[PDB]
Design an enzyme around this catalytic site. Structure first.
Site, PDB file in Angstrom:
ATOM      1  N   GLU A  14      42.419  41.800  50.412  1.00 62.87           N
ATOM      2  CA  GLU A  14      41.736  43.044  50.757  1.00 62.87           C
ATOM      3  C   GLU A  14      42.340  43.677  52.004  1.00 62.87           C
ATOM      4  O   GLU A  14      42.428  44.903  52.106  1.00 62.87           O
ATOM      5  CB  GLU A  14      40.245  42.794  50.969  1.00 62.87           C
ATOM      6  CG  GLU A  14      39.485  42.320  49.742  1.00 62.87           C
ATOM      7  CD  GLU A  14      37.995  42.116  50.033  1.00 62.87           C
ATOM      8  OE1 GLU A  14      37.227  43.102  49.967  1.00 62.87           O
ATOM      9  OE2 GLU A  14      37.598  40.967  50.330  1.00 62.87           O
ATOM     10  N   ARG A  56      31.076  36.234  43.818  1.00 62.49           N
ATOM     11  CA  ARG A  56      29.691  36.082  43.424  1.00 62.49           C
ATOM     12  C   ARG A  56      29.233  34.638  43.272  1.00 62.49           C
ATOM     13  O   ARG A  56      28.037  34.419  43.043  1.00 62.49           O
ATOM     14  CB  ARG A  56      29.445  36.813  42.112  1.00 62.49           C
ATOM     15  CG  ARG A  56      29.122  38.292  42.262  1.00 62.49           C
ATOM     16  CD  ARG A  56      28.847  38.886  40.878  1.00 62.49           C
ATOM     17  NE  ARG A  56      30.077  39.059  40.103  1.00 62.49           N
ATOM     18  CZ  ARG A  56      30.100  39.316  38.800  1.00 62.49           C
ATOM     19  NH1 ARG A  56      28.959  39.394  38.122  1.00 62.49           N
ATOM     20  NH2 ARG A  56      31.258  39.481  38.172  1.00 62.49           N
ATOM     21  N   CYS A 116      32.514  42.215  41.535  1.00 61.52           N
ATOM     22  CA  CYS A 116      32.596  41.331  42.695  1.00 61.52           C
ATOM     23  C   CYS A 116      33.109  39.959  42.286  1.00 61.52           C
ATOM     24  O   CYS A 116      32.512  39.293  41.437  1.00 61.52           O
ATOM     25  CB  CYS A 116      31.241  41.197  43.398  1.00 61.52           C
ATOM     26  SG  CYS A 116      31.322  40.018  44.811  1.00 61.52           S
ATOM     27  N   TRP A 119      32.491  37.788  53.636  1.00 64.56           N
ATOM     28  CA  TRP A 119      33.729  37.451  54.320  1.00 64.56           C
ATOM     29  C   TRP A 119      34.894  37.871  53.413  1.00 64.56           C
ATOM     30  O   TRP A 119      34.727  38.068  52.204  1.00 64.56           O
ATOM     31  CB  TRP A 119      33.774  35.959  54.672  1.00 64.56           C
ATOM     32  CG  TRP A 119      33.622  35.076  53.476  1.00 64.56           C
ATOM     33  CD1 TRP A 119      34.587  34.776  52.545  1.00 64.56           C
ATOM     34  CD2 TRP A 119      32.443  34.366  53.071  1.00 64.56           C
ATOM     35  NE1 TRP A 119      34.075  33.928  51.596  1.00 64.56           N
ATOM     36  CE2 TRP A 119      32.766  33.656  51.895  1.00 64.56           C
ATOM     37  CE3 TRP A 119      31.152  34.250  53.592  1.00 64.56           C
ATOM     38  CZ2 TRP A 119      31.843  32.854  51.231  1.00 64.56           C
ATOM     39  CZ3 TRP A 119      30.238  33.450  52.929  1.00 64.56           C
ATOM     40  CH2 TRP A 119      30.589  32.762  51.764  1.00 64.56           C
TER      41      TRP A 119
HETATM   42  C1  HEM Z   1      31.161  36.342  50.267  1.00 60.61           C
HETATM   43  C2  HEM Z   1      32.408  36.745  49.991  1.00 60.61           C
HETATM   44  C3  HEM Z   1      32.736  38.018  49.165  1.00 60.61           C
HETATM   45  C4  HEM Z   1      33.943  38.294  48.677  1.00 60.61           C
HETATM   46  C5  HEM Z   1      35.213  37.418  48.822  1.00 60.61           C
HETATM   47  C6  HEM Z   1      33.877  39.561  47.985  1.00 60.61           C
HETATM   48  C7  HEM Z   1      34.915  40.180  47.335  1.00 60.61           C
HETATM   49  C8  HEM Z   1      34.884  41.386  46.674  1.00 60.61           C
HETATM   50  C9  HEM Z   1      36.028  42.139  46.199  1.00 60.61           C
HETATM   51  C10 HEM Z   1      37.504  41.722  46.367  1.00 60.61           C
HETATM   52  C11 HEM Z   1      35.580  43.243  45.593  1.00 60.61           C
HETATM   53  C12 HEM Z   1      36.482  44.322  44.954  1.00 60.61           C
HETATM   54  C13 HEM Z   1      36.261  45.673  45.619  1.00 60.61           C
HETATM   55  C14 HEM Z   1      37.419  45.979  46.533  1.00 60.61           C
HETATM   56  O1  HEM Z   1      38.548  45.464  46.298  1.00 60.61           O
HETATM   57  O2  HEM Z   1      37.209  46.763  47.491  1.00 60.61           O
HETATM   58  C15 HEM Z   1      34.123  43.232  45.685  1.00 60.61           C
HETATM   59  C16 HEM Z   1      33.230  44.150  45.196  1.00 60.61           C
HETATM   60  C17 HEM Z   1      31.859  44.157  45.402  1.00 60.61           C
HETATM   61  N1  HEM Z   1      31.106  43.246  46.141  1.00 60.61           N
HETATM   62 FE1  HEM Z   1      31.743  41.388  46.696  1.00 60.61          FE
HETATM   63  N2  HEM Z   1      32.591  40.038  48.053  1.00 60.61           N
HETATM   64  C18 HEM Z   1      31.858  39.120  48.795  1.00 60.61           C
HETATM   65  C19 HEM Z   1      30.522  39.258  49.114  1.00 60.61           C
HETATM   66  C20 HEM Z   1      29.639  40.205  48.656  1.00 60.61           C
HETATM   67  C21 HEM Z   1      28.235  40.305  48.997  1.00 60.61           C
HETATM   68  C22 HEM Z   1      27.511  39.366  50.016  1.00 60.61           C
HETATM   69  C23 HEM Z   1      27.741  41.367  48.332  1.00 60.61           C
HETATM   70  C24 HEM Z   1      26.289  41.920  48.316  1.00 60.61           C
HETATM   71  C25 HEM Z   1      25.272  41.246  48.852  1.00 60.61           C
HETATM   72  C26 HEM Z   1      28.801  41.932  47.528  1.00 60.61           C
HETATM   73  C27 HEM Z   1      28.716  43.021  46.683  1.00 60.61           C
HETATM   74  C28 HEM Z   1      29.782  43.659  46.076  1.00 60.61           C
HETATM   75  C29 HEM Z   1      29.722  44.881  45.285  1.00 60.61           C
HETATM   76  C30 HEM Z   1      28.414  45.646  44.970  1.00 60.61           C
HETATM   77  C31 HEM Z   1      30.981  45.172  44.874  1.00 60.61           C
HETATM   78  C32 HEM Z   1      31.542  46.322  44.000  1.00 60.61           C
HETATM   79  C33 HEM Z   1      31.000  47.740  44.158  1.00 60.61           C
HETATM   80  C34 HEM Z   1      31.440  48.573  42.965  1.00 60.61           C
HETATM   81  O3  HEM Z   1      30.753  48.532  41.909  1.00 60.61           O
HETATM   82  O4  HEM Z   1      32.466  49.294  43.068  1.00 60.61           O
HETATM   83  N3  HEM Z   1      29.931  41.201  47.762  1.00 60.61           N
HETATM   84  N4  HEM Z   1      33.756  42.084  46.334  1.00 60.61           N
HETATM   85  C1  LIG Z   2      30.457  42.289  51.384  1.00 60.52           C
HETATM   86  C2  LIG Z   2      31.891  42.376  50.886  1.00 60.52           C
HETATM   87  C3  LIG Z   2      32.293  43.434  50.078  1.00 60.52           C
HETATM   88  C4  LIG Z   2      33.622  43.484  49.651  1.00 60.52           C
HETATM   89  C5  LIG Z   2      34.128  44.602  48.760  1.00 60.52           C
HETATM   90  C6  LIG Z   2      34.302  45.903  49.529  1.00 60.52           C
HETATM   91  C7  LIG Z   2      33.689  47.107  48.832  1.00 60.52           C
HETATM   92  C8  LIG Z   2      34.428  48.294  48.777  1.00 60.52           C
HETATM   93  C9  LIG Z   2      33.908  49.429  48.162  1.00 60.52           C
HETATM   94  C10 LIG Z   2      34.692  50.722  48.105  1.00 60.52           C
HETATM   95  C11 LIG Z   2      35.679  50.732  46.940  1.00 60.52           C
HETATM   96  N1  LIG Z   2      36.630  51.860  47.051  1.00 60.52           N
HETATM   97  C12 LIG Z   2      36.080  53.058  46.395  1.00 60.52           C
HETATM   98  C13 LIG Z   2      36.968  52.174  48.452  1.00 60.52           C
HETATM   99  C14 LIG Z   2      32.636  49.380  47.603  1.00 60.52           C
HETATM  100  C15 LIG Z   2      31.895  48.204  47.660  1.00 60.52           C
HETATM  101  F1  LIG Z   2      30.658  48.130  47.133  1.00 60.52           F
HETATM  102  C16 LIG Z   2      32.413  47.075  48.260  1.00 60.52           C
HETATM  103  F2  LIG Z   2      31.622  45.981  48.271  1.00 60.52           F
HETATM  104  N2  LIG Z   2      34.479  42.511  50.029  1.00 60.52           N
HETATM  105  C17 LIG Z   2      34.079  41.490  50.805  1.00 60.52           C
HETATM  106  N3  LIG Z   2      34.986  40.539  51.156  1.00 60.52           N
HETATM  107  N4  LIG Z   2      32.783  41.419  51.216  1.00 60.52           N
END
Ligand code: HEM
Ligand SMILES: Cc1cc(CCc2cc(CCN(C)C)cc(F)c2F)nc(N)n1
Ligand code: HEM
Ligand SMILES: Cc1cc(CCc2cc(CCN(C)C)cc(F)c2F)nc(N)n1
Ligand SMILES: C[C@H](O)[C@H](O)[C@H]1CNc2nc(N)[nH]c(=O)c2N1
Ligand SMILES: C[C@H](O)[C@H](O)[C@H]1CNc2nc(N)[nH]c(=O)c2N1
Ligand SMILES: [Zn+2]
Lengths: 410, 416
Positions: free
Chosen positions: A286, A112, A109, A281
């Site tokens: 994405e 974070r 993530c 957000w």
């Molecule tokens: C607040 C703005 C946030 C942004 C900009 C953001 C952005 C991202 C991005 C770009 C990814 C890469 C995965 C993808 O491309 O689909 C990701 C993964 C992830 N996010 Fe964040 N996220 C945000 C908030 C959060 C929050 C609030 C949580 C949990 C409370 C969270 C938990 C996770 C987790 C668990 C993953 C990866 C899951 C895995 O292991 O494949 N995110 N996030």
């Molecule tokens: C709260 C939040 C989450 C994300 C990332 C989106 C996200 C996508 C996947 C699937 C990955 N792939 C196998 C399809 C697993 C995740 F845990 C995950 F968080 N972005 C933003 N902006 N906010």
């Protein structure tokens, strides 16, 4: 064994000691690195207590009461409760801490830096899909906040025997349907073709558009899931237009404001929360890069370049790259104009570099997955490209879990 | 034990058994992934006769397997001959056929190289009879001439004598045979390529008269048999250069940009059957993003994004205008256009990565796997619209191999 990581753009060097607290395993070995594998391959009463003790040990350290009065008391209390019931319940304070740190530890993530601001909604008193729906609507309205988006998680009752799992069957709370056509191609979002099939195979009457918000398919206490329609006034959407090319709004594109992952599993102190929707957000790429331009998704690059009158006969004209940039300028401009929170990939990765510095300074490290932190466009002109990252698994954590329709006894 | 990888855009799954033949370590453990470390302990590099014969024997088993003569009398006689050579001379010499096989397979095993579809069409120049820096200069000039081929570039490698006791190394002190100089000004700014400021200073201290321009080909600094290195100027008519213009922006030529046509890495170590070849310059042809994305737009290199965005007149106040992304695409269009216009071989990142998927699948079919370093295979722009972004990859270390080695000015004992 006190590892170092270097930024090759700035020569900043950070020393990582956090990794020695790592417990779980990565899937790599000394003979083979699995760092590009997407997904590397109940609790007995015994393995549950070491898990609880380790979590409680770090919880009470974080409040600077390690080995104190209440610490040993709470340790005894949880010890007793497990031997009898073969599980235990978290205090509210520990639930909030556990959720914030599962995010803090999510090495994939990039967003974070906001981890300690999470709003945690306790839904452990929920018993039915209708109640689930109510908790989820309240989450959606709170997190959306009329476009001033706020991070949030809602936590449903923990697993007990694996027969009574709470599960949100959607992968995200808000996604667009996907329909297969008689002529082979796919209308709407191709990622959601099977899920869209299940919803129809369940009762959903599909409008069969290219941007149909999917219903919720909610499962409480292991029963059959139930369909629910999220009130439209709670689904904030953004029409996509371009700041220079007026013909862009004619393309008929939109996206939703609230990214809310709903199919993950939250592990705290050995306890498994199989329904825990969380939302933040969007980072612009994405939507603009992956959602819109993946060949296996909306795959719109052909139409944008055409309406740009670019020479599409040779790859070496870089017409895809050129179209890709414009799409992403459009997503950013659209959200910013409608006052919906969004971050561009340059700002978010710059913030993540600052977040790494903070974690190395105040925590001794920060697990980070380079393959997922580097944005899917313009990689090397962002600071994370030139940043070495150590990847390792810490708990509490979010994990993947099987799709429920492969598992559920219907 | 078998392993699978999945392409998530096509759902194609492949099965890797080749990783079992892997000996050397990766850097990772069960509890930590070093996948994004630039120079891990294991990817970098004297050997005694103790550990030398098993490495020879394993190479020779590979070699004779590949020519369908495993276990033959030629195979066993060669093992015997190598053993006796090792015990009495402490090292051994590769036959010409073994040297060629070795260099090709070191390229074939280079897990960070996206250009490997070409690995079997490598021209190998044997320079193991070379003894002096002047002789090295002559060999390198001929490599540069042959590889450049008036713009119809040809992959080549030149192999200087192997390490003996570590005190008599052959070394090309340059990191590439052709690179532009970089000068630090007293005011703190940098003229030319900032990646080469340190090497440039070494050349000047060794007697090079620097023209102090923005695109000065550096001299060769060549080390033979462990002697002090010596300077040589590559004849300019052998250095093919391409002025950079843009097919729509006529003001782009006025940026005064040019690049050289031949990419030729000269600081790696080639390892074959336990033998270490510390001087082994090799060359191919450029993928456009190496120049357009990294050489020109890395903040630590020429860093021209500012000037390009200015002349395009973009909103440069907010980063969310994606002016940097917009400028980068244009610069990379201009690099591809200039090379194609002057008939100098170049490949774009869409073509190269598509080729690599085809190469990789074929390697899984006929070889049982293809080691690949996703962090390095995915291009530095437009990652996810290339098919490698969606390709799972297994990274492991096979020999023969190319390895990093310390810069020689940090280890050389100066004669005076
Ligand atoms: C607040 C703005 C946030 C942004 C900009 C953001 C952005 C991202 C991005 C770009 C990814 C890469 C995965 C993808 O491309 O689909 C990701 C993964 C992830 N996010 Fe964040 N996220 C945000 C908030 C959060 C929050 C609030 C949580 C949990 C409370 C969270 C938990 C996770 C987790 C668990 C993953 C990866 C899951 C895995 O292991 O494949 N995110 N996030
Ligand atoms: C709260 C939040 C989450 C994300 C990332 C989106 C996200 C996508 C996947 C699937 C990955 N792939 C196998 C399809 C697993 C995740 F845990 C995950 F968080 N972005 C933003 N902006 N906010
Ligand atoms: C034919 C055209 C070729 C192309 C387009 C090409 C392309 C690339 C690229 C883009 C990289 C990533 C490194 C970087 O970005 O700086 C790379 C790495 C590498 N290439 Fe190739 N290459 C070609 C030919 C060769 C040849 C002929 C050899 C040797 C015989 C070679 C050996 C390597 C090695 C060893 C690496 C790894 C570098 C490292 O580990 O740091 N390549 N190549
Ligand atoms: C023959 C050839 C090689 C390359 C890749 C360039 C290359 C770059 C580095 C340095 C890595 N980084 C720390 C700067 C080490 C290498 F071994 C290497 F081969 N490309 C092309 N087109 N042709
Ligand atoms: C094959 C590879 O592991 C897969 O495509 C990954 C790579 N990196 C990614 N990075 C992000 N942020 N999101 C993704 O879905 C992926 N997909
Ligand atoms: C820190 C990170 O590992 C490093 O910047 C790598 C990333 N991937 C790369 N990939 C290529 N092709 N070339 C590079 O120089 C790098 N640098
Ligand atoms: Zn690894």
């Amino acid at each position: 064994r006190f590892l170092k990581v270097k930024n090759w753009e700035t020569d900043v060097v950070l020393t990582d000691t956090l990794h020695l607290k790592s417990t779980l395993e990565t899937g790599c070995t000394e003979h083979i690195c699995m760092g590009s594998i997407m997904l590397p391959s109940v609790r007995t009463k015994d393995q549950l207590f070491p898990l609880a003790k380790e979590f409680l040990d770090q919880y009470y350290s974080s409040i600077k009461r390690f080995g104190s009065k209440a610490h040993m008391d709470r340790l005894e209390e949880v010890n007793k409760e497990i031997e009898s019931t073969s599980t235990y319940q978290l205090k509210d304070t520990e639930l909030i801490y556990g959720a914030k740190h599962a995010w803090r530890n999510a090495s994939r993530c990039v967003g974070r830096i906001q981890w300690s601001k999470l709003q945690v909604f306790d839904a452990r008193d929920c018993t039915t899909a209708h109640g689930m729906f109510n908790y989820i609507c309240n989450h959606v309205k709170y997190a959306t906040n009329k476009g001033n988006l706020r991070s949030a998680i809602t936590i449903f009752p923990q697993r007990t025997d694996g027969k009574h799992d709470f599960r949100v069957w959607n992968s995200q709370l808000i996604r667009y349907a996907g329909y297969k056509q008689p002529d082979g191609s796919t209308l709407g979002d191709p990622a959601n073709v099977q899920f869209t099939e299940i919803c129809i195979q369940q009762g959903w009457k599909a409008p069969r558009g290219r941007f149909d918000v999917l219903p919720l398919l909610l499962q409480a206490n292991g029963n059959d899931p139930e369909l629910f329609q999220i009130p439209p006034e709670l689904v904030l959407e953004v029409p996509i237009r371009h700041p220079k090319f007026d013909w862009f709004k004619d393309l008929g594109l939109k996206w939703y404001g609230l990214p809310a992952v709903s199919n993950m599993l939250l592990e705290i102190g050995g306890l498994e929360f199989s329904a825990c929707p969380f939302s933040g957000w969007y980072m612009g790429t994405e939507i603009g890069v992956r959602d819109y331009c993946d060949n296996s998704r909306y795959n719109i690059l052909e139409e944008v370049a055409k309406k740009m009158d670019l020479d599409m006969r040779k790859t070496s004209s870089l017409w895809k790259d050129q179209a890709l940039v414009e799409i992403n300028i459009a997503v950013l401009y659209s959200f910013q104009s409608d006052k919906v929170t969004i971050v561009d990939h340059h700002s978010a990765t710059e913030s993540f570099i600052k977040h790494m510095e903070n974690e190395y300074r105040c925590r001794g490290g920060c697990p980070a997955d380079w393959v997922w932190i580097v944005p899917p466009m313009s990689g090397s002109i962002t600071p994370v490209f030139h940043q070495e990252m150590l990847n390792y698994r810490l708990t509490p954590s979010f994990e993947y879990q099987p799709d429920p329709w492969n598992t559920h006894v219907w």
